[PDB]
Amino acid sequence: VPRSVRLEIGKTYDFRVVLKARRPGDWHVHTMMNVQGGGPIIGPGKWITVEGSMSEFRNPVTTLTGQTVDLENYNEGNTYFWHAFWFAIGVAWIGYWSRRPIFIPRLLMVDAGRADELVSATDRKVAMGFLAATILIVVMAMSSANSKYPITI
Amino acid sequence: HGEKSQAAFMRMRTIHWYDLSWSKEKVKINETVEIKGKFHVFEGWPETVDEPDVAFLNVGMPGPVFIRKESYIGGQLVPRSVRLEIGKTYDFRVVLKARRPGDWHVHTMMNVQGGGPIIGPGKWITVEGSMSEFRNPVTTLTGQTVDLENYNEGNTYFWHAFWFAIGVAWIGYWSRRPIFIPRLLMVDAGRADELVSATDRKVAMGFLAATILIVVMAMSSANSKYPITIPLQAGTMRGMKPLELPAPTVSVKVEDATYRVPGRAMRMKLTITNHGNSPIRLGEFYTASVRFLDSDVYKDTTGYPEDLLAEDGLSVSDNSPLAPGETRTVDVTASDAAWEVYRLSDIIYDPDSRFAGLLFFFDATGNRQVVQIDAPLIPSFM
Amino acid sequence: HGEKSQAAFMRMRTIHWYDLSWSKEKVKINETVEIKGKFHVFEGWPETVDEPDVAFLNVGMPGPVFIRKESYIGGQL
Amino acid sequence: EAPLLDKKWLTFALAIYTVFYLWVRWYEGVYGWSAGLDSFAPEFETYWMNFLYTEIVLEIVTASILWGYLWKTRDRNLAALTPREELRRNFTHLVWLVAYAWAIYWGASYFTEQDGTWHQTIVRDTDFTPSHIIEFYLSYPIYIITGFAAFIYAKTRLPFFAKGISLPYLVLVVGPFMILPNVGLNEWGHTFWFMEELFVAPLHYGFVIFGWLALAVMGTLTQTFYSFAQGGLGQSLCE
Amino acid sequence: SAVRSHAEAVQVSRTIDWMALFVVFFVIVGSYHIHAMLTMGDWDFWSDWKDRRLWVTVTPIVLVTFPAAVQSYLWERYRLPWGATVCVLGLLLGEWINRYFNFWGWTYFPINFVFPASLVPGAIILDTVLMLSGSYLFTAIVGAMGWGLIFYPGNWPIIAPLHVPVEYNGMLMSIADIQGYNYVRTGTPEYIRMVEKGTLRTFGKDVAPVSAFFSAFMSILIYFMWHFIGRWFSNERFLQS
Amino acid sequence: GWGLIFYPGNWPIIAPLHVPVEYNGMLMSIADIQGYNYVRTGTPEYIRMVEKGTLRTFGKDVAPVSAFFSAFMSILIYFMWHFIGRWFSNERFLQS
Ligand SMILES: CCCCCCC/C=C/CCCCCCCC(=O)OC[C@H](COP(=O)(O)OCCN)OC(=O)CCCCCCCCCCCCCCC
Ligand SMILES: CCCCCCC/C=C/CCCCCCCC(=O)OC[C@H](COP(=O)(O)OCCN)OC(=O)CCCCCCCCCCCCCCC
Ligand SMILES: CCCCCCC/C=C/CCCCCCCC(=O)OC[C@H](COP(=O)(O)OCCN)OC(=O)CCCCCCCCCCCCCCC
Ligand SMILES: CCCCCCC/C=C\CCCCCCCC(=O)OC[C@H](COP(=O)(O)OCCN)OC(=O)CCCCCCCCCCCCCCC
Ligand SMILES: CCCCCCC/C=C\CCCCCCCC(=O)OC[C@H](COP(=O)(O)OCCN)OC(=O)CCCCCCCCCCCCCCC
Ligand SMILES: CCCCCCC/C=C\CCCCCCCC(=O)OC[C@H](COP(=O)(O)OCCN)OC(=O)CCCCCCCCCCCCCCC
Ligand SMILES: CCCCCCC/C=C\CCCCCCCC(=O)OC[C@H](COP(=O)(O)OCCN)OC(=O)CCCCCCCCCCCCCCC
Ligand SMILES: CCCCCCC/C=C\CCCCCCCC(=O)OC[C@H](COP(=O)(O)OCCN)OC(=O)CCCCCCCCCCCCCCC
Ligand SMILES: CCCCCCC/C=C\CCCCCCCC(=O)OC[C@H](COP(=O)(O)OCCN)OC(=O)CCCCCCCCCCCCCCC
Ligand SMILES: CCCCCCC/C=C\CCCCCCCC(=O)OC[C@H](COP(=O)(O)OCCN)OC(=O)CCCCCCCCCCCCCCC
Ligand SMILES: CCCCCCC/C=C\CCCCCCCC(=O)OC[C@H](COP(=O)(O)OCCN)OC(=O)CCCCCCCCCCCCCCC
Ligand SMILES: CCCCCCC/C=C\CCCCCCCC(=O)OC[C@H](COP(=O)(O)OCCN)OC(=O)CCCCCCCCCCCCCCC
Ligand SMILES: CCCCCCC/C=C\CCCCCCCC(=O)OC[C@H](COP(=O)(O)OCCN)OC(=O)CCCCCCCCCCCCCCC
Ligand SMILES: [Cu+2]
Ligand SMILES: [Cu+2]
Ligand SMILES: [Cu+2]
Ligand SMILES: [Cu+2]
Ligand SMILES: [Cu+2]
Structure with missing residues (x-):
């Protein structure tokens, strides 16, 4: 039962749960039935002691594509790389404009009617390049991800 | 048509239609075709489809190429929505009357409220003849036999044309004068009171009184012509008898x-x-x-x-x-x-x-x- | 009072009250009257009436001319 | 001394829409039954997906060319516009508004209720039904193009509308345009939210709301009338 | 000068009048038709949806929207009292065109099964009340009451022959009910129709009058709001960005 | 663009998490197995608002339809919040 199930009023059911130890310590473990529109139904709790180191825990899973992976660290580096890449792009976009006076002189110039002097042709070209590069990078990354993982559900 | 695009598991896990028969493969105009069979409701009903508490037995076809003469679920006529139970099997029968010539893919379907369409196997049926020969006679409790193809058509045309003509006359009475620019300038200049005269007020009063009086007289005449009327019959029919199978x-x-x-x-x-x-x-x-x-x-x-x-x-x-x-x-x-x-x-x-x-x-x-x-x-x- | 104005089919197709008894026809103040009977729920329940998942047994009268000392459904208060 | 109103242009504006949409209706009648019922079939492909691709490409090309030509040939110096030529330009803009109204009727009224009919007689299978192809992707872009062209002509040729962006004109022209993106909601309305083919469902209230913006026409009309009257026509007419 | 004589100015004004009438009429047709269908078109399409509770209640409330705004514009700016009438006429024209050429011309649904509802009397009442009183508050209240109340009596001569009882295959049916049963709407099952089915609080033959009065009250409210909606829509403002 | 680019931008990250797995006889996703194994005591499985399939769901159009609907509503919300921020930028002083 990896998904939600339907239970009938007045019926008795066997249940079994197989758990794998991950972290050391003394843990109070309970079996519970979460009911939608009702809330938690906690059962008797038992104290279980786990001895060892958390660094020894492994979660191997074999996929239908023939690959065996460890769920503890699978896809971690890819997520870090992509998030850092996009954050760096945003930081570069902000810092390109941050090299100049930011708040007070620009506000005075806009109030004085000199707003058109605050953006140059080079700035427009940089913005166009940023937009085109963002769209092209997104498209290429999607294509590469599709090529790397042609089978998804 | 429309099943190939439905999710495969939804088609697999809703209703199963088993032994089916079609009385004829080629029919003439005004001839009847009977489609009988059994349908079983799957016990593991999908959660995104509401339970068939309100279900309607329907015929899937590109329009009124046939007319559904009657439909029976478990031997009981079902002109309204019905209630079906999960995990039960039901006989169904549908008698259709041919209306339009051509080759038609006809399917039996169960429309389920909060779920959508559940299409069954489709069969190709050929209708030969002319659509002008189709007749739909119905005998009323008042002793009158009518043809539903053309019944009450002339009355509807007459009343709609009459009211449209009244509206057109009302607009055209004011449309004989300058409409937009001179009137706008006069209103802007403060001469709005000159744009409506006493004769216009009398015409408006006459229009209002005539409209109300005509509506009242028409309602009275319609009541006199048809003194026996009933409201639209609607509701969900429970207590459908399922099959008791080995x-x-x-x-x-x-x-x-x-x-x-x-x-x-x-x-x-x-x-x-x-x-x-x-x-x-x-x-x-x-x-x-x-x-x-x-x-x-x-x-x-x-x-x-x-x-x-x-x-x-x-x-x-x-x-x-x-x-x-x-x-x-x-x-x-x-x-x-x-x-x-x-x-x-x-x-x-x-x-x-x-x-x-x-x-x-x-x-x-x-x-x-x-x-x-x-x-x-x-x-x-x- | 209030039934004559209810739709005839709704009255026909909801609950049927069969053999009923009234302990007394004339009572004094502080005296008790017992009304017993059976009620059957029609299988073809109308669709515009919700299923009796939440139902209350009530006494219809123009006010607290009586006080409902107790009410039992199937022997249970 | 050309006539103030060009009858040929008005006749063309009415007749091109009339003939094109009559041919579209004939095509829908002929091929809506044999090929439009099943969406996973080759005849459906070659008779409706090709239609969709061709209409999209032609709409893009026509919109680009028309808008660019109208914006390129704008009157750089409108101070020398004579009152008679201004009146002629006002009549041309009124012809543009007539064409826009005709396209609006063809799109929002005729094919929308035709789409309603189609959905009430068959089981929906795809977002690209022949009715959807004709209504959402042909008539709506056509009236959007006509409205944009009318707005651009008014801004670039009439001194009354050249002093700024007319708010009622902008609402009347861009509001119905928002009906086209809202189609996505409609799809999201039919595939996920509402399981029934109900035409009064809230998933269609978007359409309704943007239809309300067409009422801005009244304000636009008022401006148009002033553009007709500020050139001396009003003074002569008031006499 | 733009014009050379007074007669030329009059002729030009008449031409502008005709062209602007065309523009207003057909823009109103498009917008009002899309709003009207996507608000109340399921009851308007089929004769077996024309019930006493939902149709009578819903139709005038949602259809009083455009006439209020168009009246607020036309009467205020031109003293033209035909706004509600022109809106109703345009909606009826569009609906009838679609019914004849698409509902019947394409899918072959019989016209007596797919016909629109009559709306001219309510528009006439609203227009005459506005013209005679000259005030929008009194027009709102009284004209909207009349618009809500006259909807069902105006349509009764059309739908009355369709309510003759029939014993169809052992069950009591209406002629409109048999029309809906026989002519199969594949995309419109029977459970979708929002029609009255009877309630335990339904009283002794008061369904249609109660629906009419509720529709009239909500019509008052909607007219009051859409008058100001149209007043905003009539603004002659110019933007610089 | 903001509505449409959301899912293509995130696809390179979540694509490896959608590799099918035969977990104990049932077809599961890697993200599904992640949710199954790592127990969220306060977040049962029925709470997740994810697509489960509808009888009106068509032939591989879920993500594009969702993206286009999101883009349209993004247009609306941007239009409203522009004026919301314009109000929030007011330089007004009160005396009470
Ligand atoms: C310049 C004209 C004046 C301006 C206004 C436009 C008026 C034009 C009307 C065209 C009439 C001919 C229609 C027959 C097509 C003639 C036509 O196209 O016939 C073929 C199809 C049928 O093809 P099929 O499906 O393959 O056939 C199998 C099943 N029938 O029928 C039709 O299209 C006929 C029905 C639809 C016709 C459209 C209605 C008329 C348009 C009115 C526009 C509203 C204008 C309002 C003005 C008050
Ligand atoms: C139908 C929905 C109504 C939309 C709301 C009304 C428009 C907004 C009004 C207040 C702010 C603008 C100023 C007055 C209006 C007219 C307007 O936008 O004028 C230009 C002004 C700049 O002019 P100004 O001389 O500097 O002083 C302000 C004018 N009162 O722009 C703005 O103030 C900002 C942009 C205007 C708003 C965008 C256009 C609105 C049209 C609808 C957009 C599409 C949405 C519908 C699609 C379905
Ligand atoms: C974020 C929610 C926005 C709240 C609404 C905006 C504030 C109200 C504006 C109109 C009335 C006041 C005048 C203009 C504003 C600024 C303001 O309050 O100025 C002082 C004025 C008196 O000034 P004045 O020179 O006599 O003339 C009126 C100024 N335009 O007070 C008032 O008019 C009454 C008290 C102001 C309202 C209370 C403070 C509002 C701040 C939010 C309260 C907390 C709620 C959020 C908590 C989650
Ligand atoms: C996380 C990774 C960080 C990525 C950092 C990317 C660098 C970003 C911005 C560079 C700013 C340089 C601006 C120079 C204008 C400085 C500038 O304006 O110089 C005058 C030139 C004159 O050029 P010209 O020859 O006379 O005319 C053009 C044809 N010859 O004008 C311009 O218009 C020059 C435009 C150059 C703009 C370059 C910006 C493109 C940046 C895209 C970055 C891609 C992202 C990374 C991909 C992996
Ligand atoms: C589809 C069928 C189409 C029906 C067409 C109906 C005709 C409509 C309007 C006629 C306009 C004439 C206006 C004359 C004023 C023209 C006008 O104002 O003339 C001056 C008279 C002077 O009359 P007087 O004698 O000095 O004073 C009254 C007592 N003697 O003033 C008026 O006030 C005259 C008022 C006459 C108004 C008549 C309009 C009534 C129209 C009702 C139509 C009924 C609908 C049809 C029933 C089936
Ligand atoms: C044969 C039927 C009657 C004549 C046809 C012309 C139209 C009818 C009447 C008015 C003119 C009659 C005499 C004209 C003689 C010559 C002629 O054809 O004139 C019309 C225009 C010229 O427009 P103009 O210079 O403003 O001057 C018009 C006033 N006489 O011709 C053209 O070649 C078109 C002008 C360039 C603009 C092209 C638009 C972009 C085209 C790409 C497609 C756009 C999108 C398509 C839809 C998606
Ligand atoms: C800004 C745009 C807002 C919409 C305004 C225009 C009207 C549009 C839609 C509603 C019209 C009713 C017909 C249903 C079509 C809109 C529609 O599709 O409604 C479906 C429901 C029936 O199905 P459902 O499973 O209940 O689904 C609920 C989705 N609304 O109809 C209903 O009318 C019932 C839903 C409850 C709403 C009752 C109607 C409103 C009663 C009056 C109070 C509102 C204020 C009135 C003014 C005083
Ligand atoms: C106003 C000018 C005077 C003209 C008469 C006014 C209308 C007619 C009669 C007035 C007497 C009241 C009793 C009605 C006859 C009463 C009447 O004819 O009722 C018929 C049915 C009842 O049918 P039944 O039971 O088979 O019959 C037996 C009844 N014991 O009820 C209805 O139609 C219900 C009434 C309609 C709903 C409206 C109620 C009023 C709500 C207040 C707001 C509306 C008022 C507007 C305020 C300005
Ligand atoms: C409230 C203001 C007073 C003036 C109006 C009279 C009030 C009473 C009823 C009118 C509401 C519509 C009829 C349904 C009622 C409510 C009512 O009486 O309903 C019963 C039947 C409908 O029953 P059914 O089951 O569908 O069977 C058909 C049998 N006719 O209607 C009627 O008997 C009609 C009654 C009156 C019809 C005339 C309408 C004219 C008055 C309205 C216009 C007022 C505008 C004034 C302009 C300033
Ligand atoms: C269903 C309930 C009834 C409908 C509601 C409308 C009824 C009447 C009044 C209420 C609101 C509108 C009054 C006008 C605002 C009030 C109004 O008329 O203008 C306010 C100003 C005018 O713009 P301005 O000159 O730039 O600002 C300086 C003041 N003149 O609007 C603004 O500043 C922007 C906001 C305006 C938004 C109003 C749009 C109207 C609504 C259209 C939507 C469709 C209708 C929805 C209702 C279903
Ligand atoms: C605009 C500039 C031109 C560039 C091309 C534009 C986009 C691409 C193609 C155009 C052809 C249309 C057919 C699509 C390919 C059609 C396409 O590729 O569809 C893929 C899937 C279908 O998957 P399947 O059944 O397994 O495949 C077999 C189909 N018989 O559908 C979708 O993804 C559904 C379409 C996405 C939802 C958007 C619909 C549009 C709604 C209108 C508002 C949005 C428009 C913005 C207005 C400005
Ligand atoms: C509409 C305006 C035209 C320009 C955009 C092109 C329109 C079509 C699609 C873009 C929407 C996002 C993709 C999902 C579609 C809808 C679509 O095609 O969905 C299918 C898959 C998602 O399927 P899944 O079941 O999750 O499995 C993963 C397989 N990839 O996405 C795609 O195939 C992606 C299609 C295109 C991706 C490139 C996006 C770039 C375009 C958007 C940005 C535009 C901004 C312009 C700046 C001015
Ligand atoms: C989801 C829908 C989009 C969001 C709605 C906002 C979009 C744009 C315009 C609509 C309303 C805001 C326009 C500003 C009012 C219109 C505005 O900008 O100011 C009106 C005056 C300004 O205060 P004043 O100087 O004292 O009054 C004299 C006129 N200048 O406000 C008032 O008088 C008080 C009422 C102002 C309340 C506006 C608060 C904005 C809303 C914040 C809440 C968060 C957003 C909710 C939406 C999700
Ligand atoms: Cu088929
Ligand atoms: Cu089964
Ligand atoms: Cu009693
Ligand atoms: Cu019983
Ligand atoms: Cu829709």
């Missing part, structure tokens, strides 16, 4: 069920126990309107739509008489282009890869048992 003396457990993703087939390991009823043999697997048959055990003679009939699409590792009591584990292979044509292979895009279907077992004497199977379906890519 429980299957045959038990089937699905060990594994897989499909190659490129793929035009499905494979399953099954454990079958015969609980009597003489040596039996699997003859047919029904999934989603598609029937895979084992030619050596059973042959269809009901004119089942050929695009959905695989006469030799059932391959059972060992299909020998299963002596009552024998528990044989067999590998069944359901293969047919319909798997790809009816987009059953699109279960790979489904958020729920589980299938359901019907297995038909026949003994030496020809007695048939229906076993209901459901399992998760695992795609194979290697």
